[PDB]
Design a protein around this ligand. Sequence first.
Ligand SMILES: Nc1ncnc2c1ncn2[C@@H]1O[C@H](COP(=O)(O)OP(=O)(O)O)[C@@H](O)[C@H]1O
Ligand SMILES: [Mg+2]
Ligand SMILES: [Mg+2]
Ligand SMILES: [Mg+2]
Ligand SMILES: [Mg+2]
Ligand SMILES: [Mg+2]
Ligand SMILES: [Mg+2]
Lengths: 247, 247, 247, 247, 258, 247
Amino acid sequence: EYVFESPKMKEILEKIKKISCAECPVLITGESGVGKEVVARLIHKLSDRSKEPFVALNVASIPRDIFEAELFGYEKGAFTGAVSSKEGFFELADGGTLFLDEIGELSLEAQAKLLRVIESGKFYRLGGRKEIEVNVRILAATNRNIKELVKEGKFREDLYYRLGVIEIEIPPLRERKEDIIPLANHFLKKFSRKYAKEVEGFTKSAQELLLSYPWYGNVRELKNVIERAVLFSEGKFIDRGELSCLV
Amino acid sequence: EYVFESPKMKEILEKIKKISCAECPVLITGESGVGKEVVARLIHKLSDRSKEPFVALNVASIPRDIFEAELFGYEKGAFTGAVSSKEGFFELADGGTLFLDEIGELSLEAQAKLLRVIESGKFYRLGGRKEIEVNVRILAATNRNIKELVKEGKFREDLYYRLGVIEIEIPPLRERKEDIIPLANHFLKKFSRKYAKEVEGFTKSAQELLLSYPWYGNVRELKNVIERAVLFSEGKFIDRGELSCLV
Amino acid sequence: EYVFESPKMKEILEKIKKISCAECPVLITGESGVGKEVVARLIHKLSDRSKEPFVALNVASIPRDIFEAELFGYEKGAFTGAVSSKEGFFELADGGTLFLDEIGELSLEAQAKLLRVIESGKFYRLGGRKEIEVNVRILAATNRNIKELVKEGKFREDLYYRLGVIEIEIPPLRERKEDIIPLANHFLKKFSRKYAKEVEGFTKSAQELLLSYPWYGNVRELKNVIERAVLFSEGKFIDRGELSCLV
Amino acid sequence: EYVFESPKMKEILEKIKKISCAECPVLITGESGVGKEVVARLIHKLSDRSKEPFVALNVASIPRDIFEAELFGYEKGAFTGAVSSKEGFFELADGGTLFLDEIGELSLEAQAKLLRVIESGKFYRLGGRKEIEVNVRILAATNRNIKELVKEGKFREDLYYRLGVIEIEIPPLRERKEDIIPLANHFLKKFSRKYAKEVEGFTKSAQELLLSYPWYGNVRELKNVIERAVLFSEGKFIDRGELSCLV
Amino acid sequence: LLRREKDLKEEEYVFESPKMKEILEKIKKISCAECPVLITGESGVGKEVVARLIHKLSDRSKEPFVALNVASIPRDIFEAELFGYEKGAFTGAVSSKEGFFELADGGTLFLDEIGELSLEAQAKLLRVIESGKFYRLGGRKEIEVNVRILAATNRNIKELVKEGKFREDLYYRLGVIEIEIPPLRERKEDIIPLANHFLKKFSRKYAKEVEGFTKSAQELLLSYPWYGNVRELKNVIERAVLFSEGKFIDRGELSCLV
Amino acid sequence: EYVFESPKMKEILEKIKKISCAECPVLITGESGVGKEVVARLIHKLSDRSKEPFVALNVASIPRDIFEAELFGYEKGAFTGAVSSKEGFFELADGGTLFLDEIGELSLEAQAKLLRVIESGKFYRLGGRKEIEVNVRILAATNRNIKELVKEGKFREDLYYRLGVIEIEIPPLRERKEDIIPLANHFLKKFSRKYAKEVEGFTKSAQELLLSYPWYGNVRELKNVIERAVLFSEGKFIDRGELSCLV
Ligand SMILES: Nc1ncnc2c1ncn2[C@@H]1O[C@H](COP(=O)(O)OP(=O)(O)O)[C@@H](O)[C@H]1O
Ligand SMILES: [Mg+2]
Ligand SMILES: [Mg+2]
Ligand SMILES: [Mg+2]
Ligand SMILES: [Mg+2]
Ligand SMILES: [Mg+2]
Ligand SMILES: [Mg+2]
């Protein structure tokens, strides 16, 4: 029910469908709020692994101190914790796909811990003495410029080229004008339902404006703008005037 | 109890009643001491959740070390934490409202931690392997210009669009002259009673001064000036002369 | 046992007596050694709260790391913190008065933490989920000019309006000529007693020069100068010569 | 075993004996190696506390992170302060004398922490709820020009007036010619004893040179020069030639 | 065979120079001395060797010799690893721990690359160097230890003092005895004996047939103003032996090295 | 299985064969991605220690805070953190060979710490009082010309003399014409195998681009472009079109 229109955005859809079967690293890039999360969620859904669990993690929100332990896991006892052994996030995602959003904001110290893990697909639980092997597809996302961080010495060069084997860029909305209106309508359906309103669609006078506003917040800002409009709506349609106070 | 007399403020008064039913995040701006907290607490009382918990947080007062742990919560066995597991502030506010005050003073590193939590209402407990989802309405406030801070790279662009579903600016007092006297009189009533004094109201010449002093501290300054005035009053009324030493 | 002889100090002394019933924060300013500390104790003794605890604190002296914990207090578990629950200085002063000297030396980042505590008198213990409310009258003092610093952006504007309910400035010593001699005798009386000397009073020639001194160190400097002078005293009276080497 | 043959140092010696009874802080200044430590160590021996504790401290050797803790002391709790409670240096010096060497090397921010402690002799232990009071004589030393530092804003004026009750200036060695030879013989005595040598005294020509030698390092340099000579000595006396080589 | 290993006779060492011969004698005089020593010179001149030697000829030769790169100590634990620390006062460890100073008690302490220290860091050592006294971190008992200090730097230290880049008061604590090591280019006599010594060592390890140098080669070595000094030589000789074929080395083999 | 064709690449292999017995540090120079690690990795395989461990490390990438700890290792405690004892990379490489990558990108300050370690192979564990001694062969790499860099004061002169015994450069690619083609095919074999593809070899049209030289990223770019090309391959042979699409 989602929207893929325009020559630019439709082209990406083909790329994704072909790599659905692949076991190899993925690097997703673009501004935040362009729909990168949907794509990340989509690759898993379209893959040979569609029925398995999808584990969402906000990286960098993990403290550096428990990062390795909280991720890879630990056994019973073994450096003053609990009594019983506890699974790590990788083993829970074993056979599945793990999505790390905003990887580019990760600390230099933490990257090194997962670094050796990337190539071997093997690791040691903290305090565990038996090497474990798991099968996990890695997905990554960031709203920032990764190319820059490497040049600034803020990002390891070797990690970029390992994850950046395949790189998929999402362009902003201002470079996809054809996609604007169909999306706006999709949100109307959702918001009209939520707040139980009588709204149907937008007047043409309103529609012309969206194209001239170069949308710095992309999809994420739009979704918010519509939600505002539906709430203050009176009739079933929204005029340019109701947007004017919004802009 | 609460005072709104003004063109500017009455417009806002209407705005709140419509989102009383709304489930989405709110971002309040204005100088500090214009009543941002009153607005935040009021939305809750006027909403359908008015009977549920309301959690007030300074968020600048939170220590960096426990920031992650004290917020989301943890399961027993996170690097020798306690014995027992403890819920987080998000879980405590479930069904209720969570207010993050003076958010604009937060460091970029910390802002990012909150990213996945706001929109999805989902997160992971520390040491927990089970994804938790809770229902909490989020309000935020700051006394600085956040739109400018983003442009200066001092505040995350992606976080702004998550909280900024609704944006409400509070105008200063000098742009609300009609609010001055009602506010001034209301504060006097409580203080005269509290400190058991004989004071009732203001002389005409005194009232004229309040209108001419362009109030840089806004409403918060007013309350104090009356409190200063009430304590030193002799007769039942306050003249312009008694204010002269205060201004 | 305290000395107030002067037009300047007697006027202020009256103000203190009038606010004895008031429950609100006070801001003391002045050069170092002018008695800013004395007033803070005096307000307490003359107020209705005079019989309850008076807590003296160098706020600048609080290390940043435990700054939050030592102030608000904490529950048992805090990253292997203690065993037992412990109250903070705000809770310790409940029903009493809390005196923060050198408020002006705090970093902008740290000041932000104190905001909700000052006005609401409310906070959350560390690891505690129940909002606590305390009753504390706040007294503050600083050797800096706050009105200037705010304009220089070196001090939070919003915090000033929270603490600044009552503002007391106080003049240096050179602008109080009447206090010099009465004070000098008290210290001489004190030190002659302490150090068992034969000294009684001052020669006429000595006294005239002393009054014409700029006194950058104010009363504290006097106390030191008398202590220095008494030790080297020979006769029962002190001449201009023993003081002359200091000026 | 200490040497004072100079007119200036003899006057100071008298000055010291008169102030032996005082309980108040002393500030010693001068070039390094002029004997600032012997005087400080001596005053204790001549005071009423000569049998009481003498605490020697390099305030510069205290690391920034525990500066607060190592000084005031701490209770089991607080930091993750492990298990045992520990006294602070101030509690250690109660009834005794506290010697702070190289006070002049403190960072302006750090100076402020000890401020209330110096004058009041009062503080709170870390995690402690009972105010502790001690009676401590404070001694301080610096190799820097302190009068200058205040004027440049590099040293707080407020601390100076707390510490600066008694100020003792030690002149360099080049301004005490009378002290040179008596000192030299004493140093000759010790090293001749330690290294079991045959040396007795100086040639007439050599002694003259020492007097014309602008000692920049003062006594500390002399001691070293003597130590070199005793080691390399052959006969019972040292000629100008043995010194000519140095340097 | 590899790098003796039972070291009967010997690692030995070469001193044939007038300057170095004079310095060797000076050392013999301080064998009884308990006082700090300051060694200066270009890099690779044997400053470490002298330091190890002063220890060997002293009365403390049988007691501990603590070798330390001070520059390598982290700023954060610098105070702690040095003076030592008690059970608390950090979030450090559990148990109390001795410092390197307390470890060298009765012995000799060698501080290498002292000249690279930051002014903030130098000030901390003051009471410890001259008085030999300090307080352990979190400790309330004043500790007193007996330690002879040796120091080294590859820079000009008097210069640093005059430039305000090195604390003056500290200089007079360490600088009781000061030893300036001249470079090799000012010791011409040491050149040939050294090269021969290195050649023999490497010939054994890497089993080659080389014995000595041609007359033409020796001339070049003398005209090479050795900016890396002996350390450069040791490397240069080691380089030649591996690539050596016959028993002698000509000037041609050196040209690619210089 | 490594590819050496060009005369430059073939001659160097012979040089190594002679020094296989040598135990001394090595200095490798050339552009990034020229095979410095492979040359280095081969040397180990050819050495007397070839059967012992080989430790690869990027030095410039280590964070300053843990730089010392991860390198020398540490005993339990002696740090704020670190429950567990840790071997260092030096001790981990004991009896083996240690490869330091991108030394030329290392901070000047960090270089000074390594001095005694390189030549003497001795150090003290962090918090350990027992001296550690190891037998380790040194390998070094840089993307810059070091002899020049020292003269610019960007690299310590004394450290160079430790690593710079033998200096061997490598041409990037452009002076090796013969190595280009054999390499590309070698990867096709692995990548066709790894991802189970139908690919066999390259068409003549593909090769024409390969002969169009300008590889600014040298060999490192090649491996990635081929890895990229194989995934996007359609037929059993690859035309210029999938390669043309990148650069
Ligand atoms: N047969 C080969 N195929 C691909 N790459 C090779 C081959 N032989 C050597 N290399 C190159 O060896 C290099 C090893 O990395 P290196 O260039 O030493 O690191 P840096 O780029 O940091 O100098 C790789 O970049 C790789 O391209
Ligand atoms: Mg995202
Ligand atoms: Mg607020
Ligand atoms: Mg004060
Ligand atoms: Mg001193
Ligand atoms: Mg050296
Ligand atoms: Mg490399």
